[PDB]
């Protein structure tokens, strides 16, 4: 529906209560989120931004995006900014009322308490006004940021779809995804904070024009302190930059680890790799600890500023022999606000302004790319003809001309309507370039073209949009049943479409993942045929088709349906060329022949942004069980927390005794500033950070030990990308951000609790006033979290549609440019962006409501405490002032405390998953199988079921079968890689009676895909450090690795960087065979040695196996006829059955 509300409801955010109620009661769905108002429609934002951007481009000599952006959206920005400034002015000014109240209570004046209470009610009204004029302005600024982001995304999508063809191969997909990823939160949330660029200077000017002029020492200290904070900021980036290189090196080791869990389990390498990963983590831990230490010093310096910033301000005026407590209390209340405005607000505003300007400049720079210029095709006679065509891909050579290499030179031809052509050439000859220049994507430097306009495209690359078969074929045109039936019958895709349960509206995903290459190609041909045009362009139409189907499809459709319509074909076959009318051949970017035979014969696709939807969906947030598990894992962490609590309580007790009981007048500062009174020093908080780092290291080590040495069925139940995502993101969050968030939350809760306790001790009525306030805080936070977490999760799940649409549009850019479905793609992109905008808008609205209500509750607490304290007829001069100051300066710390309280739960939502993966479960030589059965996962397809066979010692077994029949599954079942029931006895012992560890070592196998890691040859041969140089040399000599060792510059220590691709397939097979010879096993297992092998390495492998394992049993797997001469026994897998034969010549009797 459409939201609508009155002025009071708009100001107090009372219209978000229905969705809070629904989310609290039950799980939120995509249906309950109401429709965005028309103000924030993607189409409206795009139109409004373009109407100014095009005018700016047409008028301004120097183009800058901010020039149009200001005349677009600056007015409301300033309108919200003035409200923000007037709200902050009240916070700046309110301590004057505090000082006057203190003067009223002090025995200097005889004025009754009536004036004091008349001022206190005004102070509370001032807080109410400041809240009411602060929070809605922040929400409005967030709204402005929303419109900003939506308009920017729409315009940049329009540009990236209108891109020129030349810059497409300047591959910057990573740059584009980074641009659309890193900006969404930064340019949206930061706009509200961006307005403090002049608010802080105006506030400090007001503060120091309202303090008696002396007081400049406070500015001198803050200026040094502000520069000091930036001084440690550079150190942070110095350590982070250094460590970022090492985490990349360690991560790729884990990435290569998941892809070969089978090989790792077979080789029993869990301990060595565990030690290697532990060593790498130990190396990175020092840098992480240094970064955490400097962050702690920065935070502690900020917290300890509070005392010195007033101390160094009062001492210049303390030499004048007298300070009234009213003056010191009011200068404390002024200096806290001054510090808040100087040390944090101004640097944050400057940094966010710089980041926003950089992002806008980068977006403009990308947008200023050269456009795609289409050409009218109204030139008559509707025939394809060119003359003197010169083509240059790069603009520099295109505008100069033979300085650069061309791709088409001096090509001429002319074909009447109905005649079909054929182009043949080598790979990269330029057939695709000729197609592009015919289309108009490539601009010809020389040569005028006159031909028809209606064109059709079937690209080399298969592209399918996320729709259905009918939509993929017709592209929204009127559904012609006769044409559709004719095209499906001609393309012979009916036999494929009718196999599915769905017949007419089969829905596909992105990129046609459901189908295969042949189906995608035939769908592309069907689309090309269906597209009504007088010039059909094809680019390798049958690249993924078989020979028979490719031969049949030509005479079925091409010269039967559009035989009277002109088309251009890409082919290299004599029959197609013979049927073709005129012929063109391209060589080295130049045409080779023109005429007839009458003359001739006479870096990731499924990115983490897309995997996050399936990764974060299992959070199910969190419970206190994970809190307890995370807090009790390490003893020293508990001891340090206990020590911190004891120190806090001791400091509170000392302050209490001091208040119960010369420089005394300058001693009240320490107690009067809870920020410096209860902040943890460098001797009581550094062990906390150290313990957090140790907890992170222990959790990572246990997670590695759990993911490794785990049942393969359960491990394969999850995907490799998903299991790697944890080590990529969750460990980094738990190690870097989590300790800092934990420390900040602990400190901000400790200061607030100490302030409340001491205030209650000075006045016991405030103790009973606080309990309802605390329970209200807790209840309201619990109420808000349930809806907030669900809304954030839904928004995160809704992020990936935008990027999937982006990649889908990019993959088929040429097809979209040829077909003119730009409006359809724009409206679909806007449809997705509207849902994402609605999610983010509701999240922002509920966050603003939460902040409003917590501030209102604190205001109620403040009025209660202040009125009760001022009305009570207390004794002493300090008590009233100190209580008022403490209860007045808390709110700034309380906001950060509650923000950290929500953020710590948001972060620990990840240690929840980490603990779940901690909690995942864990587990001659003759053979005789007894009813073997296994499957990839429980409930899967039992490839092997009720299997019984035996192998004689000192023999060989040859295994033959089609691909995918289950040979790999049988080898895994032998290896105990998968869950199995039954037994196989090696001379009498099965899996059950002996340890699986020694079971694995008794075997030996090379995988279908060999495994190698980024390590030296010595480490890849002997990861366990159980071998010596002489025996390694002996193994290398026996297997024949001397040439392999000497061929590389590093003698036996050449590092295998980037997956060890230096070795060939045969070299890798020799490597793993030598490794198996090292791991001495009485039995050997084999799996397809000749997938991409050459005869010399094949025969050397045969020689090595014959010489090394002549007296064992080898289960060889190969389909070659010549290979099967050395297999005394035979075995075949034919659809879940096994037949063992004494010879192969009798097998040929069955299947000659
Ligand atoms: N947009 C482009 N910008 C720059 N170079 C390009 C672009 N498109 C293609 N090329 C390159 O120009 C050359 C022309 O090759 P083209 O693909 O046109 O020939 P082909 O024989 O049809 O190719 P294929 O081997 O893909 O069947 C190739 O080296 C190709 O990589
Ligand atoms: N990781 C996996 N998860 C789920 N199913 C799988 C997995 N790997 C393979 N399969 C299933 O097993 C089939 C292939 O079985 P497998 O590779 O073990 O037999 P094969 O005859 O040795 O294969 P090939 O000779 O093609 O390597 C696949 O088509 C699929 O149905
Ligand atoms: Mg090509
Ligand atoms: Mg296989």
Residue numbers in the entry: 5 to 217, 222 to 409, 435 to 635, 751 to 769, 844 to 883, 911 to 1172, 1207 to 1435
Give verbatim lines from the article:
The cystic fibrosis transmembrane conductance regulator (CFTR) is an anion channel that regulates salt and fluid homeostasis across epithelial membranes. CFTR belongs to the ATP-binding cassette transporter family of proteins, but uniquely functions as an ion channel. It consists of two transmembrane domains that form an ion permeation pathway, two cytosolic NBDs that bind and hydrolyse ATP, and a cytosolic regulatory (R) domain that includes several phosphorylation sites.
To explore the molecular basis of this shift, we determined the cryo-EM structure of the dephosphorylated wild-type CFTR in the presence of 3 mM ATP to 4.3 Å resolution. However, at both NBD1 and NBD2 binding sites, density corresponding to the ATP molecule was clearly evidenced. Dephosphorylated CFTR adopts an NBD-separated, auto-inhibited conformation.
